[PDB]
Amino acid sequence: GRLIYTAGGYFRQSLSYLEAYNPSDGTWLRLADLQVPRSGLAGCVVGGLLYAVGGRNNSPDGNTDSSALDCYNPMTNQWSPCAPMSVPRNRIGVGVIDGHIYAVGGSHGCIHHNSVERYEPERDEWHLVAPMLTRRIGVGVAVLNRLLYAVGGFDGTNRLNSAECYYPERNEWRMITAMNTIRSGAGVCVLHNCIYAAGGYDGQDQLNSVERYDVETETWTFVAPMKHRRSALGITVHQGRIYVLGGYDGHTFLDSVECYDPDTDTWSEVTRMTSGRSGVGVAVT
């Protein structure tokens, strides 16, 4: 009964929606809105709990970068406040290692963070770990073999095709091989032991392309495109299949949800969101 949770986003202003997709029966649930609307946030899950991390309230009465961490219980349909981050991080990436949420990069104003902090749920505290080699907002994050990979983004001056790896136990970052395309606000996730960098923004155009990093060959490889060039897309994995949700395609805020089958090497559209929206965060539980 694991759902695809889609939290926050942007249409006209930052959104509050929390809604869930059942790929099995194709339904959408409407769930308890966020307390404070936010876009450019990230989602993860730890221990059957869903966390919305960072982002931004872009509203009519002004506009404010999030240091927030809020936690949702599906068992209670309730959001609870959580210890805020040391800094606010809009356009943030997040991953999980040992039930520990890594808050990676993001922006405050146009202060572009290279810094990373680890949240620990039991104790409810953030601590700073070793900073990335590169400031990164619009960054995708992928956990793989208990290594944390930060992929692209936008360093403050140029868009990024570069990726780097964190070694949690050594507390160190190391540059891995750069992507075929430059990607800010791509969808980054992991599937069958490869890192997928889906869509994003390359400077000139919004992207439909997708390439997957083989961690042992050290090689990025294109795979089938999406049908809808997109960025600021939500991404996740659900039963051997990648789900890209929504996004910004240059002109509109997409409601489309496309689905990658790695075996057939194809995407198909499987549902629509209830309303078009960019820059959500999504997490499965």
Ligand X SMILES: O=C(O)[C@@H]1CCCC[C@H]1C(=O)N1CCc2ccccc2[C@H]1CN1C(=O)c2ccccc2C1=O
Residue ranges that bind ligand X, judged by CB under 6 A: 10, 39-40, 56, 58, 90-91, 138, 184-185, 231-232, 248, 278-279
**Complex with ligand X: residue 67 or 184, whichever CB lies closer:** 184
Least distance in Å: CB of 1 to ligand X? 29
Q: From the CB of 146, what's the least distance to ligand X, in Å?
A: 25
Burial of 57 (0-12, 13-18, 19+ CB in 10 A): buried
Provide the minimum distance between the beta carbon of 204 and ligand X in the complex, in angstroms, as a whole number: 14
Q: Which is nearer to ligand X, 120 or 205 (CB)?
A: 205
What are the strands, taking DSSP E only, across 27-139? Answer: 27-31, 42-46, 49-53, 56-59, 62-65, 69-73, 78-82, 93-97, 100-104, 107-108, 111-112, 116-120, 125-129
Q: Which is nearer to ligand X, 23 or 185 (CB)?
A: 185
Nearer to ligand X, 90 or 161 (CB): 90
The rounded distance, in Å, linking the Cα atoms of 183 and 151 is 8
Residue nearest to ligand X (CB): 185
Q: Taking the complex as a whole, how short is the minimal distance between the CB of residue 140 and ligand X, in angstroms?
A: 9
Phi, psi of 131 (to 5 degrees): -75, 155
Q: Are 123 and 100 in contact (CB under 8 A)?
A: no
